[PDB]
Design an enzyme around this catalytic site. Structure first.
Site, PDB file in Angstrom:
ATOM      1  N   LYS A  65       0.821  -1.206   0.000  1.00 25.57           N
ATOM      2  CA  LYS A  65       0.000   0.000   0.000  1.00 25.57           C
ATOM      3  C   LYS A  65       0.857   1.259   0.000  1.00 25.57           C
ATOM      4  CE  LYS A  65      -2.240  -1.283   3.759  1.00 25.57           C
ATOM      5  NZ  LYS A  65      -1.387  -2.478   4.068  1.00 25.57           N
TER       6      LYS A  65
ATOM      7  N   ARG B 226      -8.541   1.146  10.039  1.00 26.32           N
ATOM      8  CA  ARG B 226      -7.999  -0.143  10.395  1.00 26.32           C
ATOM      9  C   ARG B 226      -8.949  -0.994  11.214  1.00 26.32           C
ATOM     10  NH1 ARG B 226      -1.955  -0.049   9.710  1.00 26.32           N
ATOM     11  NH2 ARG B 226      -1.270  -2.190  10.192  1.00 26.32           N
TER      12      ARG B 226
ATOM     13  N   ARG C 223      12.125  -4.565   4.251  1.00 29.20           N
ATOM     14  CA  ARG C 223      11.610  -3.216   4.056  1.00 29.20           C
ATOM     15  C   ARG C 223      12.578  -2.191   4.630  1.00 29.20           C
ATOM     16  NH1 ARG C 223       5.460  -2.170   5.322  1.00 29.20           N
ATOM     17  NH2 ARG C 223       6.001  -2.737   7.466  1.00 29.20           N
TER      18      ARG C 223
ATOM     19  N   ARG D  33      12.442   0.072  10.129  1.00 31.92           N
ATOM     20  CA  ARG D  33      11.456   0.325  11.167  1.00 31.92           C
ATOM     21  C   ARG D  33      11.683  -0.596  12.350  1.00 31.92           C
ATOM     22  NH1 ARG D  33       5.700   0.450   8.130  1.00 31.92           N
ATOM     23  NH2 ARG D  33       5.234  -0.612  10.101  1.00 31.92           N
TER      24      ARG D  33
ATOM     25  N   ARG E 115       1.182  -8.484  13.914  1.00 29.15           N
ATOM     26  CA  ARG E 115       0.396  -7.531  13.133  1.00 29.15           C
ATOM     27  C   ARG E 115      -0.568  -8.251  12.203  1.00 29.15           C
ATOM     28  NH1 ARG E 115       4.929  -4.456  12.497  1.00 29.15           N
ATOM     29  NH2 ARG E 115       5.381  -4.477  10.277  1.00 29.15           N
TER      30      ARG E 115
HETATM   31  N1  LIG Z   1      -5.336   3.232  11.695  1.00 27.25           N
HETATM   32  C1  LIG Z   1      -4.613   2.642  12.660  1.00 27.25           C
HETATM   33  N2  LIG Z   1      -5.190   2.170  13.779  1.00 27.25           N
HETATM   34  C2  LIG Z   1      -4.488   1.605  14.770  1.00 27.25           C
HETATM   35  N3  LIG Z   1      -3.164   1.425  14.750  1.00 27.25           N
HETATM   36  C3  LIG Z   1      -2.470   1.855  13.670  1.00 27.25           C
HETATM   37  C4  LIG Z   1      -3.166   2.491  12.555  1.00 27.25           C
HETATM   38  N4  LIG Z   1      -2.238   2.813  11.641  1.00 27.25           N
HETATM   39  C5  LIG Z   1      -1.046   2.396  12.116  1.00 27.25           C
HETATM   40  N5  LIG Z   1      -1.192   1.823  13.329  1.00 27.25           N
HETATM   41  C6  LIG Z   1      -0.129   1.332  14.208  1.00 27.25           C
HETATM   42  O1  LIG Z   1       1.104   1.479  13.507  1.00 27.25           O
HETATM   43  C7  LIG Z   1       1.670   0.182  13.302  1.00 27.25           C
HETATM   44  C8  LIG Z   1       2.341   0.123  11.949  1.00 27.25           C
HETATM   45  O2  LIG Z   1       1.348   0.221  10.933  1.00 27.25           O
HETATM   46  P1  LIG Z   1       1.744   0.602   9.414  1.00 27.25           P
HETATM   47  O3  LIG Z   1       2.819   1.656   9.354  1.00 27.25           O
HETATM   48  O4  LIG Z   1       0.466   0.834   8.646  1.00 27.25           O
HETATM   49  O5  LIG Z   1       2.523  -0.746   8.985  1.00 27.25           O
HETATM   50  P2  LIG Z   1       2.061  -1.971   8.028  1.00 27.25           P
HETATM   51  O6  LIG Z   1       1.957  -1.267   6.680  1.00 27.25           O
HETATM   52  O7  LIG Z   1       3.209  -2.945   8.141  1.00 27.25           O
HETATM   53  O8  LIG Z   1       0.747  -2.491   8.553  1.00 27.25           O
HETATM   54  C9  LIG Z   1       0.519  -0.796  13.490  1.00 27.25           C
HETATM   55  O9  LIG Z   1       0.996  -2.070  13.849  1.00 27.25           O
HETATM   56  C10 LIG Z   1      -0.234  -0.106  14.617  1.00 27.25           C
HETATM   57  O10 LIG Z   1       0.449  -0.208  15.853  1.00 27.25           O
HETATM   58  N1  LIG Z   2       4.551  -5.812  -5.714  1.00 26.64           N
HETATM   59  C1  LIG Z   2       5.549  -6.014  -4.842  1.00 26.64           C
HETATM   60  N2  LIG Z   2       6.373  -7.076  -4.952  1.00 26.64           N
HETATM   61  C2  LIG Z   2       7.373  -7.282  -4.071  1.00 26.64           C
HETATM   62  N3  LIG Z   2       7.635  -6.448  -3.036  1.00 26.64           N
HETATM   63  C3  LIG Z   2       6.861  -5.360  -2.842  1.00 26.64           C
HETATM   64  C4  LIG Z   2       5.764  -5.061  -3.754  1.00 26.64           C
HETATM   65  N4  LIG Z   2       5.158  -3.943  -3.334  1.00 26.64           N
HETATM   66  C5  LIG Z   2       5.835  -3.522  -2.249  1.00 26.64           C
HETATM   67  N5  LIG Z   2       6.860  -4.367  -1.964  1.00 26.64           N
HETATM   68  C6  LIG Z   2       7.844  -4.330  -0.860  1.00 26.64           C
HETATM   69  O1  LIG Z   2       7.344  -5.083   0.236  1.00 26.64           O
HETATM   70  C7  LIG Z   2       7.379  -4.323   1.431  1.00 26.64           C
HETATM   71  C8  LIG Z   2       5.971  -3.921   1.797  1.00 26.64           C
HETATM   72  O2  LIG Z   2       5.426  -2.925   0.938  1.00 26.64           O
HETATM   73  P1  LIG Z   2       4.699  -1.658   1.630  1.00 26.64           P
HETATM   74  O3  LIG Z   2       4.315  -0.848   0.438  1.00 26.64           O
HETATM   75  O4  LIG Z   2       5.554  -1.111   2.765  1.00 26.64           O
HETATM   76  O5  LIG Z   2       3.351  -2.397   2.206  1.00 26.64           O
HETATM   77  P2  LIG Z   2       2.196  -1.849   3.206  1.00 26.64           P
HETATM   78  O6  LIG Z   2       2.229  -0.327   3.170  1.00 26.64           O
HETATM   79  O7  LIG Z   2       0.930  -2.410   2.616  1.00 26.64           O
HETATM   80  O8  LIG Z   2       2.573  -2.390   4.549  1.00 26.64           O
HETATM   81  C9  LIG Z   2       8.268  -3.122   1.154  1.00 26.64           C
HETATM   82  O9  LIG Z   2       9.624  -3.446   1.484  1.00 26.64           O
HETATM   83  C10 LIG Z   2       8.115  -2.933  -0.335  1.00 26.64           C
HETATM   84  O10 LIG Z   2       9.276  -2.405  -0.975  1.00 26.64           O
END
Ligand SMILES: Nc1ncnc2c1ncn2[C@@H]1O[C@H](COP(=O)(O)OP(=O)(O)O)[C@@H](O)[C@H]1O
Ligand SMILES: Nc1ncnc2c1ncn2[C@@H]1O[C@H](COP(=O)(O)OP(=O)(O)O)[C@@H](O)[C@H]1O
Length: 214
Positions: free
Chosen positions: A13, A88, A123, A156, A167
């Site tokens: 995303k 979320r 990542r 991160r 998660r």
């Molecule tokens: N809308 C939300 N509601 C609750 N917790 C959130 C939300 N967005 C992010 N978080 C918190 O931030 C953490 C990292 O989320 P995020 O950066 O979206 O990572 P990922 O893309 O790996 O899910 C989550 O595990 C949670 O602790």
């Molecule tokens: N289509 C894809 N194929 C392989 N790896 C991807 C793809 N899209 C994103 N990634 C990689 O996988 C990880 C997760 O993507 P990210 O965009 O951070 O996901 P989200 O925001 O949904 O948690 C990042 O390290 C990113 O570079």
């Protein structure tokens, strides 16, 4: 244009949000980025999230609702925005609805659970901007450096395998129900809904999204 991106952690995303913000000129609203930034700056609204994110758990609904309300009131959202990581939970989606925050597109990233860990452990992020990379699957032009500024990428604190699996459990219990939520909204005519194969290469997912958005 207003967009929600849905999908599991690691589905892609944040990666695709950057392209959409570049092409369509709407800001990316990432609650994870905002929370991490609040922790880093010690901002009164969000610094509380440190230990929760570390545990792989969701922050409270009220905290992220407040952060998003504050953010989308800003002038750069007047012409639309993209939400990535929010809502979320069903209460977060209902809070949007009750506030009159309608969206044009809900885009669901379909990715097998089995791909998530190896995506997230590779990542790397440019914290000031939110830009995301992967050491093997989507690397920067220069290893460990942001493409746009050249600044050092970081990992991160919550991108360890065991935290990812926590998660993913939270996602399945609390967040996956939003697929049905927005599918139902689309059937009422309140948004357009599309599902994309998030296992395609980054460039092909991007192309698939451009077909939908225009
Ligand atoms: N809308 C939300 N509601 C609750 N917790 C959130 C939300 N967005 C992010 N978080 C918190 O931030 C953490 C990292 O989320 P995020 O950066 O979206 O990572 P990922 O893309 O790996 O899910 C989550 O595990 C949670 O602790
Ligand atoms: N289509 C894809 N194929 C392989 N790896 C991807 C793809 N899209 C994103 N990634 C990689 O996988 C990880 C997760 O993507 P990210 O965009 O951070 O996901 P989200 O925001 O949904 O948690 C990042 O390290 C990113 O570079």
């Amino acid at each position: 244009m207003r967009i929600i991106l849905l999908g599991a952690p690691g589905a892609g995303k944040g990666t695709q949000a950057q392209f959409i913000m570049e092409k369509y000129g709407i800001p990316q609203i990432s609650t994870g980025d905002m929370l991490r930034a609040a922790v880093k700056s010690g901002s009164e609204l969000g610094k509380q999230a440190k230990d929760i994110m570390d545990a792989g758990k969701l922050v409270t609904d009220e905290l992220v609702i407040a952060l998003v309300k504050e953010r989308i009131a800003q002038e750069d959202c007047r012409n639309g925005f993209l939400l990535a990581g929010f809502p979320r939970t069903i209460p977060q989606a209902d809070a949007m609805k009750e506030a009159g925050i309608n969206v044009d597109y809900v885009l669901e990233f379909d990715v097998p659970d089995e791909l998530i860990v190896d995506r997230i452990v590779g990542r790397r992020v440019h914290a000031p901007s939110g830009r995301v990379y992967h050491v093997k699957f989507n690397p920067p032009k220069v290893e460990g450096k942001d493409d746009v500024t050249g600044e050092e990428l970081t990992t991160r604190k919550d991108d360890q395998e065991e935290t990812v699996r926590k998660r993913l459990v939270e996602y399945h219990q609390m967040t996956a129900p939003l697929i049905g939520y927005y599918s139902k909204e689309a059937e009422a005519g309140n948004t357009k809904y599309a599902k994309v194969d998030g296992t395609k290469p980054v460039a092909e997912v991007r192309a698939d999204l451009e077909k939908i958005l225009g």
